[PDB]
Structure 1
């Protein structure tokens, strides 16, 4: 049967350096958070009803985020390339407070927040399999466009402008989501 879950969770630790760092992460239940990782493994398939990442400061540097929908694409390498992507967002790596709004799930003057939402209304299909990191790498190894039907999207993140060549703790990214899960099964 259809089960609905809405919840927020720590999704990544952020560090800044002087040299830009593009890295990305798949938007599936396995990867967003270690709680939902565990919870959703008890259903075979899922469907995002709403997902958002949002940075929280805790200094010199810039943070950059946006989504790709075809696992077939090449992951940007410059702030520029990234600048094109859907759901593009950016701000100062020491700015962010106004965000907690969305994570604490309350209220409100957002303009100043570093946060972006999956399109959902523009995803591939409705029901994706619960898949794991390993699974994705694996699949990719055969045909890339095998993967886009395994994973709804990927968040790509850029981090430059640091004043240190050594990584400096800047803040973090929280996923807040509303997922539906069908088809029970043994963890």
Structure 2
């Protein structure tokens, strides 16, 4: 009672596949997970992750050279991996060919999952996060805060998803796949949409 529990699955990020190891990162918070949730979660001041799961889903030919990597960092102050190696250490390291993972599909439509060993997907260890409840922060205000000092962020966001997309066959981008997020969340302490930062 009091809370509100949404459980959904939307595209979290489109992936381009190249040959020069490009390394990105997304905060594991509502405003960043995806457009849809970003829209809802706003109506609630704080929230708590219950089950966060990013899953890669291909959309390219089998003749598409390339591998993708995912992992998690938690002390926002830490330096985002420079080498994919450094990345393979993080919690929940995972990596497969940018055209495989077809099987992970059963995480997005919420169907009965058969064998998920071939699925390029990792989860968030919710039990080991700083706070139980976090404040809904807008990318804007967040940046402004990390501008003064990054550490002021450790209490605004639970973790960060480190993504690496190396190995390709061309110097320019080639559409490869998408990373959808399948989360279960508890939204609380409602608020006017435009009053959230």
Q: When you count strand as a share of all residues, which structure comes out higher? A: 1
CA distance in 1, matches of 2:143, 2:79: 15
Please give the root-mean-square deviation of Cα atoms over the aligned residues, in Å. 1.1
After superposition, give the CA deviation of every residue in 1:33-53 in whole Å (9 maximum; x if it has no partner).
111101010000000001000
**1:139 positional shift:** 1.1
Normalized against structure 1, the TM-score is what? Answer: 0.97
- Aligned residue pairs: how many? 186
Structure 2 portions without partners, runs of 5+? 58-62
CA distance in 1, matches of 2:75, 2:183: 21
**1:104 positional shift:** 1.1
CA distance in 2, matches of 1:102, 1:53: 9
Does residue 97 (structure 1) correspond to residue 98 (structure 2)? The answer is: no
CA distance in 2, matches of 1:64, 1:82: 8
**1:17 positional shift:** 0.7
**1:171 positional shift:** 0.4
Q: Which secondary structure does the structure 2 equivalent of 1:106 belong to?
A: coil
**1:136 positional shift:** 1.8
Q: Which secondary structure does the structure 2 equivalent of 1:31 belong to?
A: helix
Normalized against structure 2, the TM-score is what? Answer: 0.92
After superposition, give the CA deviation of every residue in 1:103-152 in whole Å (9 maximum; x if it has no partner).
11122211100000011111110111110111221111112111011111
**1:79 positional shift:** 1.0
Deviation beyond 2 Å, 4+ runs, structure 1: none
Alignment of 1:9-28 (within 5 A): 9-28=10-29
CA distance in 2, matches of 1:153, 1:90: 19
- Name 2:64's counterpart in structure 1: 59
CA distance in 2, matches of 1:141, 1:9: 30
**1:72 positional shift:** 1.2
Q: Which secondary structure does the structure 2 equivalent of 1:88 belong to?
A: strand
CA distance in 2, matches of 1:133, 1:100: 29
Does residue 165 (structure 1) correspond to residue 171 (structure 2)? The answer is: yes
CA distance in 2, matches of 1:167, 1:113: 23
CA distance in 1, matches of 2:108, 2:71: 18
